[PDB]
From a paper:
EBOV GP, a trimer of GP1-GP2 heterodimers responsible for cell entry, is recognized by the humoral immune response during natural infection. EBOV GP contains a heavily glycosylated mucin-like domain (MLD) that shields the glycan cap and neutralizing epitopes in GP1 and GP2. We first examined the contribution of two regions in GP2, namely the stalk and heptad repeat 1-C (HR1C) regions, to GP metastability in a mucin-deleted Zaire EBOV GP construct (GPΔmuc).
We next combined the W615L mutation and “L” extension in a single construct named GPΔmuc-W615L-L-foldon, or simply GPΔmuc-WL2-foldon. In three production runs, GPΔmuc-WL2-foldon consistently outperformed the wildtype construct, showing a twofold higher trimer peak in the SEC profile and a ~2.6-fold greater trimer yield after SEC (1.3 mg versus 0.5 mg). The thermal denaturation midpoint (Tm) value for the stalk-stabilized trimer was 3 °C higher than the wildtype trimer (67 °C versus 64 °C). To understand how the HR2 stalk and HR1C mutations affect EBOV GP, we determined crystal structures for the unliganded GPΔmuc-foldon with WL2 and WL2P2 at 2.3 and 3.2 Å, respectively. Both proteins showed a three-lobed, chalice-like trimer structure. We previously hypothesized that a bulky, inward-facing W615 at the top of the coiled-coil destabilizes the HR2 stalk, whereas the W615L mutation would improve its packing. Indeed, W615L exerted a positive effect on the stalk structure (bottom center and right).
Numbering used by the authors:
A (entry chain B), B (entry chain B), C (entry chain B): 502 to 626
The structure:
């Protein structure tokens, strides 16, 4: 399903902040006693609207809210951290949750090299 | 392992309540400020004892308690939400955690279409 | 990457304590009301330095600390329980996250039995 930014305006540049699970710690800065405070753990980046991604991302986050709010209403967890790991499991289940019938449309097995390697095995005669 | 209901009685109908992660929100009812209270998020259903499922389910929940209690004794989490996602990971690991030897009993790959498609490739001569 | 114990000393024996998710409960000891207190849920074992595992394990835990501390700095969870389940998902994603090209180095499918079973199918003539 396509994404159409229907917002009054779009800031086409995303000046973002985030963290990294393993920065390049210099010396003892990785030790919590010596490391940065809560305010100094962030990295920054700047992404422009190539492929209309930024304006599409703003619209996607807007459209996601209804389903996300309905999900949070139905969970008893106070803080939800598992949405992404859940997507990864459903990703694997939708491809490998059942028997993989080679050449079927829902089986992500490419047997081309196997077939030729077996095909050219008869090329002795 | 089969399930034998050994309870003094069995209520053969399951009038159940649950939630749905995405109901058919009408208008602004998905917005938490406008939506239902904690008491009005539930849906209901009624399931009868077809295939003896309800009486078997009551016995299964009874038999599950020992293993479930022993699991909860050994975990340090105050609230456990991960039992089902854990089953899904172990489900995938038991089938795809190692090399899939085609035609072996523990490899869920059906190569039938591949074999015939290669077999009838020799039917030119 | 190899592990070289660079510690001042190594205790080459690991007298360890842990729990088991399902011990052999005798009678009603699995019932929390009747079972052991928090102090009596532990089992013990003793492992010696076969294959240099114990001294290697002490060095590994030492070397793990920097990456583990940097990970904990970047997470907003107060208590992290998901590192191992995360490794299991990444384990499956690195092998089955994309199309499995048979005979490729990143596809863990062994088609040997399939090939011979197809090869000796031509042995009628
Ligand atoms: C995702 O993105 C969409 C689109 O941007 C967001 O939609 C907005 O939804 C809210 C409802 O939650 C709307 O609020 C209502 O606004 C009306 C009128 O607002 C007027 O002023 C706006 C500010 O300038 C303007 O943008 C509006 O323009 C459009 O819409 C009108 C139709 O109303 C249309 O004729 C125009 O041509 C524009 O297309 C509009 O001029 C206001 O009257 C509402 O108030 C009543 O209802 C609420 C209950 O919802 C009640 O509390 C009030 O007391 C009052 O009774 C209400 O405030 C908002 O206007 C929408 N914005 C747009 C641009 O459509 C959506 O919210 C985003 N989702 C998330 C999760 O962020
Ligand atoms: C899963 O399902 C099973 C089966 O329904 C549940 O098993 C029950 O286990 C508990 C133990 O935790 C039992 O409690 C004990 O009951 C005895 C005697 O109970 C009598 O009265 C019952 C109520 O009517 C009746 O059902 C019983 O009937 C059967 O059993 C007797 C053998 O005792 C047999 O002869 C009959 O023919 C029936 O087959 C029985 O008539 C009671 O004396 C016990 O008390 C002592 O011990 C406890 C410690 O456990 C102590 O605290 C007391 O002070 C006292 O010293 C105890 O109360 C219960 O009887 C079992 N029910 C059945 C039907 O077998 C099991 O609990 C379920 N699991 C979960 C997690 O829910
Ligand atoms: C993983 O394993 C490694 C190796 O065991 C651990 O490394 C240790 O790192 C800490 C830093 O966090 C070091 O602390 C510093 O120690 C110096 C000097 O210590 C002296 O005394 C030690 C105790 O007997 C001895 O082991 C040391 O020996 C070696 O190192 C010297 C070089 O210094 C070398 O010449 C020798 O031949 C040995 O190889 C040494 O004799 C001390 O001066 C430091 O103090 C200053 O700096 C700190 C800031 O870090 C500051 O707070 C102080 O006030 C002071 O200004 C500091 O205490 C420790 O010595 C290292 N140990 C070894 C054996 O190398 C590492 O910690 C482990 N990781 C985890 C997570 O556990």
């Amino acid at each position: 399903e396509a994404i159409v930014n229907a917002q009054p305006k779009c800031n086409p540049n995303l000046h973002y902040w985030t963290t990294q699970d393993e920065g390049a710690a210099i010396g003892l800065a990785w030790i919590p006693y010596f490391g940065p405070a809560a305010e100094g753990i962030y990295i920054e980046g700047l992404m422009h609207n190539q492929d209309g991604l930024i304006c599409g991302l703003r619209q996607l986050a807007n459209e996601t809210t209804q389903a996300l709010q309905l999900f949070l209403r139905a969970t008893t967890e106070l803080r939800t951290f598992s949405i992404l790991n859940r997507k990864a499991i459903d990703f694997l289940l939708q491809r490998w949750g059942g028997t993989c019938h080679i050449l079927g449309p829902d089986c992500c097995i490419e047997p081309h090299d196997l077939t030729k390697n077996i095909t050219d095995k008869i090329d002795q005669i």
